[PDB]
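Whiteboard transcription, Tuesday session. T.W. wrote the structure tokens on the left side:
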């Protein structure tokens, strides 16, 4: 149970594009059931309560934010 507090760090992702960091608290079961780790630009620590303002509501919400961690966007 509990939450998985994820903080991703902003980093360049191709000239003209990048990936904006984020802070999101994910319910453990939702996180363990499915998650994608592609780079090392993140950090994780568990806790009983959500540590960040943005809290994942459901499996679909997590897949969206998780994918947002890798989708390159113009600066």
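and on the right, the sequence the group agreed on:
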């Amino acid at each position: 149970g509990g939450y998985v507090n994820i903080k991703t760090f902003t980093h360049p992702a191709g000239e003209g594009k990048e990936v904006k960091g984020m802070e999101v608290s994910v319910p453990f079961e939702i996180y363990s059931n499915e998650h994608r780790i592609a780079d090392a630009h993140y950090q994780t620590f568990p806790s009983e309560k959500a540590a960040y303002t943005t809290v994942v509501t459901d499996a679909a919400d997590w897949r969206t934010k998780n994918a947002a961690m890798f989708t390159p966007t113009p600066v």
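Someone added at the bottom: The chain is about 20% helix and 35% strand.
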